Write a protein that binds this DNA or RNA. Structure first.
Ligand SMILES: Nc1ncnc2c1ncn2[C@H]1C[C@H](O)[C@@H](COP(=O)(O)NP(=O)(O)OP(=O)(O)O)O1
Ligand SMILES: [Mn+2]
Ligand SMILES: [Mn+2]
Ligand code: NI
Length: 422
DNA sequence: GTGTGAGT
DNA sequence: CTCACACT
């Protein structure tokens, strides 16, 4: 149960090349063809953020210029993100995301984790399904696209063989058997994904396991329109060669410290250290967390749908682009406040609350820190012009140039945020 | 109130 | 870019 961290059934659903599929739903002509989506069109045709699987076979990857990508995929077609106030506009994608989320919310409550993925806690649905099943076996036909991680031992054929070996050894009578709960959870996810495709046409992948970390890791294991079930017994093999920085929450300084201090590279190697050793090197909390996590145990619950605590937006101006004149800072503050007003207005329309505070943050050229300073003021009226003047008033004192004709030092970031909701 | 980390 | 939270 809880001792072995097998108390819940959690799943993660992530859309395959989400932006590409959204383009395919609205503009048919790009469908079933190698394509990509670029961001900025003049420098080099734009950075690539979403690539179709057909094009991935040719070696094309994201974070590389469109013209440089045409090198190995001459058939490659390009689609562009609309631009607004100098930054990307994702309304189309966010609305499609909402569509999918609403369809998923029918089977169970979800936790939106990004623009194209969300976690689902199926524990209750699994109980209901185990009752309604009434002891009938689970045939492989109920899982047409499910992969069992770690099997077979000793491509569609491999999937079916692993599924047969998994199903033939499952407990039938012990209704609290972790493996049985996962199998039923995968059945429910098969239904959920079938419904999602039927009503929207989108394809996706999913991961099924006992916690968020394993569900996420499992989702990307068998990438396009496939789902992976990760049992507690399969964790050791899966972790044997799993990069530490690939585990949710260990991708930053903590993970790097673990690698550096213990001289290891893969998650599976942490199993050899004692809990006291992990606590003596990383602290009580991180030590216990690592000790349980390397054994497949994690407890963050899938928290329910929530109202945002803040609404904000920002923009970066690197190098040459650094804001030097007063006109520039005034104009960009105004642009930000107009986007803010648009969002605050929709927010107030949908949730009957008004933000009472405006937080202003900036970054000065030459400073390594994320923000040079942050200040706040009352946000009484949802008027972009007023907010722009208030933000300017708090940031104007910073200007060190007694000339008053320019900004010295320049600003490399502007951030506006509404909070203290009611 | 700052720092960290996930996800784009 | 956008956001949340743990710290403290
Ligand atoms: N750095 C970035 N900046 C802006 N948009 C981005 C971005 N990175 C990703 N996007 C957008 C591009 C993507 O369309 C969207 C989903 O991100 P994923 O789920 O991580 N990748 P995908 O869904 O494409 O495919 P797959 O399921 O095989 O992983 O995020
Ligand atoms: Mn995706
Ligand atoms: Mn994703
Ligand atoms: Ni004015």
């Amino acid at each position: 149960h809880m001792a072995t961290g097998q108390d819940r059934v959690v799943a993660l659903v992530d859309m395959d090349c989400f932006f590409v599929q959204v383009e395919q739903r609205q503009n048919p002509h790009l469908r079933n063809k190698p394509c990509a989506v670029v961001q900025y069109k003049s420098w080099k045709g734009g950075g690539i953020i979403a690539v179709s699987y057909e094009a991935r076979a040719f070696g094309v990857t994201r974070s590389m210029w469109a013209d440089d990508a045409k090198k190995l995929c001459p058939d490659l077609l390009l689609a562009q993100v609309r631009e607004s106030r100098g930054k990307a506009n994702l309304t189309k994608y966010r609305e499609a995301s909402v569509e999918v989320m609403e369809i998923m919310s029918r089977f169970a409550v979800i936790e939106r984790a990004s623009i194209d993925e969300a976690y689902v806690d199926l524990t209750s649905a699994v109980q209901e399904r185990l009752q309604k099943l009434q002891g009938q076996p689970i045939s492989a036909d109920l899982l047409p696209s499910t992969y069992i991680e770690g099997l077979p031992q000793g491509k569609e054929g491999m999937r079916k063989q692993g599924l047969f070996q998994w199903l033939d050894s499952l407990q039938i009578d012990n209704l609290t058997s972790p493996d049985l709960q996962l199998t039923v959870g995968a059945v429910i996810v098969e239904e959920m994904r079938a419904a999602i495709e039927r009503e929207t046409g989108f394809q996706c992948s999913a991961g099924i396991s006992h916690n968020k970390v394993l569900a996420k890791l499992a989702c990307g294991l068998n990438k396009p329109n496939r789902q992976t079930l990760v049992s507690h017994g399969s964790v050791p093999q899966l972790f044997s060669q799993m990069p530490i920085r690939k585990i949710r929450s260990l991708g930053g300084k903590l993970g790097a410290s673990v690698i550096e201090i213990l001289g290891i590279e893969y998650m599976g190697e942490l199993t050899q250290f004692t809990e006291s050793q992990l606590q003596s090197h990383f602290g009580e909390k991180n030590g216990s967390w690592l000790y349980a996590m390397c054994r497949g145990i994690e407890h963050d619950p899938v928290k329910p749908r929530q109202l945002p605590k803040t609404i904000g937006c920002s923009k970066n101006f690197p190098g040459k682009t650094a804001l030097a004149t007063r006109e520039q800072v005034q104009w960009w503050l105004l642009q930000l406040a107009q986007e803010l007003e648009e969002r605050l207005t929709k927010d107030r329309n949908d949730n009957d609350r008004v933000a009472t505070q405006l937080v202003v943050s900036i970054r000065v050229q030459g400073d390594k820190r994320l923000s040079s300073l942050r200040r706040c003021c009352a946000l009484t009226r949802y008027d972009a012009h007023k907010m722009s003047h208030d933000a300017f008033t708090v940031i104007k004192n910073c200007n060190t140039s007694g000339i008053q004709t320019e900004w010295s030092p320049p600003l490399t970031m502007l951030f506006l945020c509404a909070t203290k909701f009611s």
